Design a protein around this ligand. Structure first.
Ligand SMILES: *[C@@H]1O[C@H](CO)[C@@H](O)[C@H](O)[C@H]1NC(C)=O
Lengths: 45, 48
């Protein structure tokens, strides 16, 4: 039900696209998102 | 590869790749969702 827009990962290879910006800086303007320490599976555990 | 470039006065740093965007005949620059340039028409080859 909840859609998480950031969901930080390794997105440099992902970023390259026809509509490159696709977005919330797309990293290029200096804004990134760090992953949580506890993954969703670890919280589920 | 990551190069510096100057395309008809527009300058910057980046990797230039083959585009699949279709510019209409009068367009020279393209921009993304955040009003920054993300594509150019080559002044000599007219490739986007
Ligand atoms: C510029 O000159 C080159 C010479 O080979 C030609 O191939 C190219 O099409 C020319 N571009 C324009 C826009 O006239």
């Amino acid at each position: 039900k909840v859609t998480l827009a950031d969901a930080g990962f390794i997105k440099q290879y992902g970023d390259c696209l026809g509509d490159i910006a696709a977005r919330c800086a797309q990293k290029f303007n200096g804004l990134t998102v760090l992953p949580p320490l506890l993954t969703d599976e670890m919280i589920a555990q | 590869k990551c190069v510096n470039f100057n395309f008809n006065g527009l300058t910057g740093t980046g990797v230039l790749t083959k585009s699949n965007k279709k510019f209409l005949p009068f367009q020279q620059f393209g921009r993304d969702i955040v009003d920054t340039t993300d594509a150019v028409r080559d002044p000599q080859t007219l490739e986007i």
